[PDB]
Amino acid sequence: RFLKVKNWETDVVLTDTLHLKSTLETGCTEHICMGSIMLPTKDQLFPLAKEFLDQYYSSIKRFGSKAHMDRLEEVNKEIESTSTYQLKDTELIYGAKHAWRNASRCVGRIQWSKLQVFDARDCTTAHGMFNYICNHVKYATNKGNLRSAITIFPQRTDGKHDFRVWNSQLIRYAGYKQPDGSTLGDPANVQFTEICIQQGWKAPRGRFDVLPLLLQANGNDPELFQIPPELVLEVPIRHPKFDWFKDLGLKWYGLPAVSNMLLEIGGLEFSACPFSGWYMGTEIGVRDYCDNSRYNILEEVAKKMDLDMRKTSSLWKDQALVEINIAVLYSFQSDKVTIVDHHSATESFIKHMENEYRCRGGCPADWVWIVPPMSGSITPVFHQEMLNYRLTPSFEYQPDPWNTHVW
Amino acid sequence: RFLKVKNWETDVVLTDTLHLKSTLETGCTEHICMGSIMLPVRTKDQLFPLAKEFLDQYYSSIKRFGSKAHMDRLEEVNKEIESTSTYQLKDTELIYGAKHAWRNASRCVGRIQWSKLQVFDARDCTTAHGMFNYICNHVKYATNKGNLRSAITIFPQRTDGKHDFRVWNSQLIRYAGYKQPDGSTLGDPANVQFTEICIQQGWKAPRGRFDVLPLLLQANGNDPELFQIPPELVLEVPIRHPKFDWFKDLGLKWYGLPAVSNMLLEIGGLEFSACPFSGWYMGTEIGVRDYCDNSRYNILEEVAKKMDLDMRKTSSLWKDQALVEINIAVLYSFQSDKVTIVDHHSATESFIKHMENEYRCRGGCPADWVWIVPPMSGSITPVFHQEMLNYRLTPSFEYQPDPWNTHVWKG
Ligand code: HEM
Ligand code: HEM
Ligand SMILES: Cc1cc(N)nc(COCC[C@@H](CN)OCc2cc(C)cc(N)n2)c1
Ligand SMILES: Cc1cc(N)nc(COCC[C@@H](CN)OCc2cc(C)cc(N)n2)c1
Ligand SMILES: C[C@H](O)[C@H](O)[C@H]1CNc2nc(N)[nH]c(=O)c2N1
Ligand SMILES: C[C@H](O)[C@H](O)[C@H]1CNc2nc(N)[nH]c(=O)c2N1
Ligand SMILES: [Zn+2]
């Protein structure tokens, strides 16, 4: 019930007391660990409100004050009456920052307190959402000097009026399945890309076509919008030593911006809440480029390097994987667009773990996701025991809306 | 209750019913996952259930379930427990049990090989010298001049827990480490303490960078004894790189035989506290962990120096770059000297096939993702993308305290 975690490289031992505030469930039991699965009323709402307001007022050193009790009172009044309630701006800012502090899969959390929050609760139409998103993208991009932000659309009501952003990120490349049997562009997005066509987009049918936003306001059918091309910062990918690398014609976008998640604050559900920071190099170079189900460019790169592709034990995949990742980091740095490498990012997160243990008595972390998809054991998070648990406020997954929505 | 695991690269879904036969706890609850935590005297009363379970399993596998022979054996074990408070396994049960312990080892990527395992019965062993003899035979048989064969050696089970057989070494073959007055380490930092025990026990240490440690052996609860493995029996491989001629001047070598000697084999409630077992290496165990962990040989800097990589900022990926070269070198060296080894692409691909086979024939395969995914190039191996269920079956390999922490010195 007081739990220790050890680092096996530094012998440093931390004690975790924060897990005892754990509210949600893991998928795990005493008989089966599910640590590696990707996805494992008036009544219910007041408990959830109180727990949140309790943490808010405690965090402002005002726990048990009249202001605290008054708000608890007022929120109670409002729920009994209206069956939901509204967050004060300050609460909303605190809850969003905290949903990020609590994301156990995020290596980037040392940054959690510098989140710019844009309150879009007054938005009513998709065009409004388009406007709020364009502003988010531009503020966050900041001419390549990236700044973290989140934009919060109105909260769920009766569930018949959700605001959703259909895209999974604000900025992603299209995918088209070809007669040739293969797949052009990003195969992750094939299905979404078809819905844009079914909804009316005219795809350039290219390899790196920035997708149209598909926006749903007040539970209405969703609507198409192109992001002003001038707002979508992109980086052409070159190598500091391999001149031929440019000839691959690889580019990636600067702005990682997750748009399909659901933000839960004090019981309220914000089903559209796109947020963004900046990339860790491996996200693009290891996963986007090299996953079999993605752009999968290892075969082609290794060929240009003239490596012995005859046998797996030449480690030609591994060799090419490194150079690709050097190239991503090099390109972004040269174009002055913010990026972080896996060494620096995991080192930073260890320091952030330290701080959270000292100051909060823990830090939920999911090892499976925190350890980078290349060079695991040479980054220090590999050697670091972590405890994974669910704290609220939080971001949660939700079904792709095309399975949910009715036309 | 059925459970599905998905593969995110192939969309293959598999169904697990085998987790239904799970006994021991994981360490996880509905409120906490402890899946990345490294480590999360028996009465008659607890014993016969565990005996019976095991023998039902055994007897199913040989398709004799409920036979006369099954029933006789149950009754026999029953009596033997009530009379002597324990029981002895037949050879066939021992064999079956040990294979299954491996089969159930959810942190083991090599399990496709689970059924080819040479079992050596050392249950007649009575002394440390007797242990040494058995172990030398094990090293030599398994080594097989480079064409490694899986094997395990099983010494007598625990009785009152005052008479334990233990191999104080964590592996039968490992290099010494010596902390120096300046704070640096000569040799393998992982073995500093055990080295010190060996020294304190009377071993004269060469004090080199690759000194094969002496076996330190405990029989029947007695104080342990030092023995040097005959060096002619210790197959080693000098490390060179196919392209970099300066690689050999680093002076690296490694031993061919990975042989774990610190685990506890549980079978039908019986506890075998000395059961050294051996396989062959996955290249990354040496190349990534043994050479490149900061708390081991830690050679990244010196390889990168020699490669003249840009070392001034991490974002050159100089570490990742040296790491690959070293792993190329380990694998090249072993193949060149004809010592069996497997690379991590080939090991993980084979493991995915074993795993699907296990679903189809057995109704599952417990697997620990944190351990199965190699410690370099994670996502370019097919296991990264495989959802896994982790749960404990018996028979099994368990951890146990290091024996200097618990042993009662007779002096
Ligand atoms: C500052 C730059 C940031 C870096 C380098 C970063 C890093 C990461 C990484 C490496 C992942 C794993 C995802 C994957 O591999 O596909 C992740 C997931 C996540 N991050 Fe962060 N992050 C950053 C900013 C943020 C911000 C601003 C938020 C919230 C406001 C956030 C919340 C999350 C959430 C909720 C997930 C899980 C996504 C999922 O489960 O699918 N990240 N982030
Ligand atoms: C065929 C050759 C084999 C290969 C390539 C292989 C590979 C591995 C690897 C990579 C690990 C993770 C250890 C680490 O990275 O530190 C492992 C762990 C394990 N293996 Fe296998 N293995 C093989 C044979 C065997 C045999 C013969 C047994 C027992 C009969 C076995 C039982 C285990 C156990 C119990 C663990 C976990 C050890 C621990 O947590 O301390 N392995 N093996
Ligand atoms: C298929 C799938 C399902 C699922 N639930 N999650 C994933 C992976 O998460 C997708 C979003 C990932 C992709 N690199 O980005 C996380 C992230 C967010 C932010 C704000 C910054 C950053 N660098 N990285 C994939
Ligand atoms: C903390 C800790 C405790 C403990 N008992 N074991 C470990 C790590 O495992 C050590 C043994 C590892 C070394 N790579 O060997 C596993 C293995 C066994 C066998 C039979 C073959 C093989 N290739 N690999 C770590
Ligand atoms: C099956 C497994 O859970 C899945 O492949 C996970 C593994 N770890 C990951 N880690 C990160 N950061 N991102 C991912 O998408 C994944 N995928
Ligand atoms: C804390 C963490 O569980 C620990 O470093 C584990 C991670 N995965 C591992 N995986 C293997 N194969 N071997 C190891 O020693 C470890 N160490
Ligand atoms: Zn778990």
Q: Residue A96: is it exposed, middle or buried by C-beta count within 10 angstroms (0-12/13-18/19+)? A: buried
DSSP A286: I
Residues whose beta carbon lies within 6 Å of some atom of ligand 1: A 100, 103, 105-108, 111, 115, 148, 150, 258, 261, 275, 277-278, 280, 283, 340, 345, 369, 395
- Say yes or no: A78 and A104 in one domain: yes
| Residue A26 to residue B25, Cβ atoms within 8 A | no
Please check whether residue B277 is in contact with residue B260, taking contact to mean a CB–CB distance below 8 angstroms. Answer: yes
B363–chain A nearest CA distance, Å: 15
- Say yes or no: B140 and B218 in one domain: yes
DSSP A308: -
A359 is known to lie in a ligand binding site: no
- Residue A391 is assigned to a structural domain of this protein: no
Kindly state whether A12 is in contact with chain B, defined as any CB-CB distance less than 8 angstroms.
no
* List of residues 6+ apart from A256 with CB closer than 8 A: A169, A276, A277, A278, A279, A283
B377–chain A nearest CA distance, Å: 4
Please check whether residue B309 is in contact with residue B316, taking contact to mean a CB–CB distance below 8 angstroms. Answer: yes
Selected residues 128-157 of chain A with any CB under 8 Å from a CB in chain B: none
Three-state SS sequence of chain B = CCEEEEECCCCCEEEECHHHHCCCCCCCCCCCECCCCCCCCCCHHHHHHHHHHHHHHHHHHCCCCCCHHHHHHHHHHHHHHHHHCCCCCCHHHHHHHHHHHHHCCCCCCCHHHCCCCEEEECCCCCCHHHHHHHHHHHHHHHHHHHCCCCEEEECCCCCCCCCCCEECCCECCCECEEECCCCCEEECHHHHHHHHHHHHCCCCCCCCCCCECCEEEECCCCCCEEECCCHHHCCEEECCCCCCHHHHHHCCEEECCCEECCCEEEECCEEECCCCEECCEEHHHHHHHHHHCCCCCCCHHHHHHHHCCCCCCHHHCHHHHHHHHHHHHHHHHHHHCCCCEECHHHHHHHHHHHHHHHHHHHCCCCCCHHHHCCCCCHHHCCCCCECCCECCCCCEEECCCCHHHCCCCCC
- CA–centroid distance, residue A18 to ligand 7 (Å): 17
Place of tokens 């089966």: A32
- CA–centroid distance, residue A389 to ligand 7 (Å): 10
Distance between CA A100 and CA A391 in Å, rounded?
10
- Residue A303 is assigned to a structural domain of this protein: yes
- Residue A204 is assigned to a structural domain of this protein: yes
DSSP A7: B
| Residue A375 to residue B374, Cβ atoms within 8 A | no
* List of residues 6+ apart from A398 with CB closer than 8 A: A260, A261, A262, A271
Q: Among B36, B95, B103, B107, which residue has the most ligand 2 atoms within 8 Å of its CB, making it the best to mutate?
A: B107
**CA triple A100-A102-A103, angle to 5 deg:** 65
The letter for the amino acid at B280 is: W
- Residue B106 is assigned to a structural domain of this protein: yes
| CA distances in angstroms from A382 to A28, A340, A377, B376, B382, listed in the order given | 21, 18, 5, 11, 19
- Residue A322 is assigned to a structural domain of this protein: yes
- CA–centroid distance, residue B400 to ligand 6 (Å): 17
Of B202, B196, B262, which is closest to residue B227 (Cα–Cα)? B202
Mutate to test the interface with A, among B317, B351, B392, B394 (most CBs of A within 10 A): B317
Of A24, A20, A86, which is closest to residue A53 (Cα–Cα)? A86
Of A216, A33, A13, A61, which is closest to residue A127 (Cα–Cα)? A216
Which pair of tokens denotes residue B260?
């774990």
Of A334, A228, A327, which is closest to residue A285 (Cα–Cα)? A327
A364–chain B nearest CA distance, Å: 9
Compute and round to an integer the Cα radius of gyration of chain A.
23
Of A226, A198, A262, which is closest to residue A130 (Cα–Cα)? A226
Distance between CA A300 and CA A43 in Å, rounded?
58
Distance between CA B139 and CA B136 in Å, rounded?
5
| Residue B378 to residue A377, Cβ atoms within 8 A | no
Which pair of tokens denotes residue B83?
């009379």
Let me know if B108 is a catalytic residue. yes
- Say yes or no: B342 and B357 in one domain: no
How do strand A116-119 and strand A149-152 relate by DSSP bridges?
Answer: parallel
Local structure of A235: helix, strand or coil: strand
- Say yes or no: A46 and A112 in one domain: yes
Kindly state whether A381 is in contact with chain B, defined as any CB-CB distance less than 8 angstroms.
no
CATH of residue A47: 3.90.340.10
CA of B396, nearest ligand number = 2
Q: What are phi and psi of A169, to 5 degrees?
A: -120, 155
Q: How far is CA A218 from the centre of its chain?
A: 24
- Say yes or no: A101 and A49 in one domain: yes
Distance between CA B290 and CA B244 in Å, rounded?
20
DSSP A384: B
Selected residues 322-341 of chain B with any CB under 8 Å from a CB in chain A: 323-324, 327-328, 331, 335
The letter for the amino acid at B370 is: V
CA of B34, nearest ligand number = 7
Distance between CA A250 and CA A97 in Å, rounded?
34
Query: Crossing angle for the helix pair B91-103 and B44-61, nearest 10 degrees?
Result: 90
Query: In which element (H, E) is residue A183 found?
Result: strand A183-185
DSSP A160: S
Q: Within a 10 A sphere around the Cβ of B19, how many other Cβ atoms? A: 20
Q: Ligand 6, closest atom to CA A6? A: 1
Mutate to test the interface with A, among B8, B22, B36 (most CBs of A within 10 A): B36
Which pair of tokens denotes residue B188?
């393998």
Query: In which element (H, E) is residue A136 found?
Result: helix A126-141
Q: For residue B395, say if its preceding peptide bond is cis, omega within 30 degrees of 0.
A: yes
Of B305, B339, B323, B331, which is closest to residue B375 (Cα–Cα)? B323
User: Which of B29, B36, B386 faces A30 most closely, judged by CB atoms?
Assistant: B29
Compute and round to an integer the Cα radius of gyration of chain B.
23
Domain that holds residue B136: 124-149+164-235+399-403
* List of residues 6+ apart from B342 with CB closer than 8 A: B110, B280, B281, B282, B283, B350
B370 is known to lie in a ligand binding site: yes
Distance between CA B236 and CA B337 in Å, rounded?
9
Of B409, B406, B393, which is closest to residue B41 (Cα–Cα)? B406
| Residue B390 to residue A32, Cβ atoms within 8 A | yes
Kindly state whether A293 is in contact with chain B, defined as any CB-CB distance less than 8 angstroms.
yes
Method by which the model was determined: X-ray
| Residue B343 to residue A33, Cβ atoms within 8 A | no
Q: Ligand 1, closest atom to CA A261? A: 35
Distance between CA A62 and CA A53 in Å, rounded?
11
Q: Within a 10 A sphere around the Cβ of B85, how many other Cβ atoms? A: 13
* List of residues 6+ apart from A351 with CB closer than 8 A: A110
Which pair of tokens denotes residue B311?
């070392």
How do strand A339-340 and strand A394-396 relate by DSSP bridges?
Answer: unpaired
Please check whether residue B286 is in contact with residue B254, taking contact to mean a CB–CB distance below 8 angstroms. Answer: yes
After which residues are there C–N gaps above 2.5 Å in chain A? 40
Please check whether residue B19 is in contact with residue B366, taking contact to mean a CB–CB distance below 8 angstroms. Answer: yes
| CA distances in angstroms from B212 to B16, B206, B255, listed in the order given | 44, 10, 9
Could you tell me which residues are beta bridge partners of residue B310? Answer: none
Q: What are phi and psi of B232, to 5 degrees?
A: -60, -20
B292 is known to lie in a ligand binding site: no
Query: In which element (H, E) is residue A131 found?
Result: helix A126-141
Distance between CA B106 and CA B394 in Å, rounded?
11
Dump the DSSP string for A248-275: G--EEES--EE-S-EEEETTEEES---E
Please check whether residue B369 is in contact with residue B390, taking contact to mean a CB–CB distance below 8 angstroms. Answer: yes
Q: Within a 10 A sphere around the Cβ of A227, how many other Cβ atoms? A: 18
- Say yes or no: A68 and A126 in one domain: no
- Say yes or no: B225 and B185 in one domain: yes
Which pair of tokens denotes residue A77?
């009044």
How do strand A279-280 and strand A339-340 relate by DSSP bridges?
Answer: parallel
- Residue B3 is assigned to a structural domain of this protein: no
**CA triple B391-B395-B398, angle to 5 deg:** 70
Please check whether residue A382 is in contact with residue B294, taking contact to mean a CB–CB distance below 8 angstroms. Answer: no
Could you tell me which residues are beta bridge partners of residue B253? Answer: B238
Q: Among A26, A37, A38, A168, which residue has the most ligand 5 atoms within 8 Å of its CB, making it the best to mutate?
A: A38
| Residue A32 to residue B288, Cβ atoms within 8 A | no
* List of residues 6+ apart from B66 with CB closer than 8 A: B59
| CA distances in angstroms from B105 to A320, B4, B60, B369, listed in the order given | 33, 20, 20, 12
CATH of residue B240: 3.90.1230.10
Q: What are phi and psi of A186, to 5 degrees?
A: -100, 115
Place of tokens 């896994």: B388
Counting the structural domains of chain A, the total is: 3
Which pair of tokens denotes residue B62?
């040989």
Kindly state whether B159 is in contact with chain A, defined as any CB-CB distance less than 8 angstroms.
no
- Say yes or no: A180 and A218 in one domain: yes
| Residue A36 to residue B300, Cβ atoms within 8 A | no
- Residue B60 is assigned to a structural domain of this protein: yes
Please check whether residue A390 is in contact with residue A366, taking contact to mean a CB–CB distance below 8 angstroms. Answer: no
CATH of residue B202: 3.90.440.10
Distance between CA B36 and CA A385 in Å, rounded?
6
* List of residues 6+ apart from B149 with CB closer than 8 A: B116, B118, B141, B142
- Say yes or no: A267 and A152 in one domain: yes
Query: In which element (H, E) is residue A355 found?
Result: helix A342-360
Q: How far is CA B247 from the centre of its chain?
A: 29
Distance between CA B393 and CA B100 in Å, rounded?
9
Q: Ligand 5, closest atom to CA B386? A: 1
Please check whether residue B8 is in contact with residue B354, taking contact to mean a CB–CB distance below 8 angstroms. Answer: no
B76 is known to lie in a ligand binding site: no
- Say yes or no: A34 and A100 in one domain: yes
* List of residues 6+ apart from A32 with CB closer than 8 A: B3, B19, B22, B26, B28, B389, B390, B391
Of B53, B21, B29, B16, which is closest to residue B270 (Cα–Cα)? B53
B114 is known to lie in a ligand binding site: no
* List of residues 6+ apart from A184 with CB closer than 8 A: A175, A176, A177, A178, A205, A206, A207
A382 lines ligand 6 (CB under 6 A): yes
Dump the DSSP string for A57-111: HHHTT-TTSHHHHHHHHHHHHHHHHHSS----HHHHHHHHHHHHHT-TT-TTGGG
Local structure of A215: helix, strand or coil: strand
- Of B346, B363, B382, which residue constitutes the final position of a domain? B346
- Say yes or no: A284 and A168 in one domain: no
| Residues on chain B touching A378 (C-beta within 8 angstroms) | 288, 292-293, 300, 319-320, 323, 375-376
- Say yes or no: A37 and A74 in one domain: yes
Q: For B26, name the nearest residue in chain A, comparing CA atoms only.
A: A30
Of B130, B108, B338, which is closest to residue B219 (Cα–Cα)? B130
Distance between CA B296 and CA A387 in Å, rounded?
26
- Residue B410 is assigned to a structural domain of this protein: no
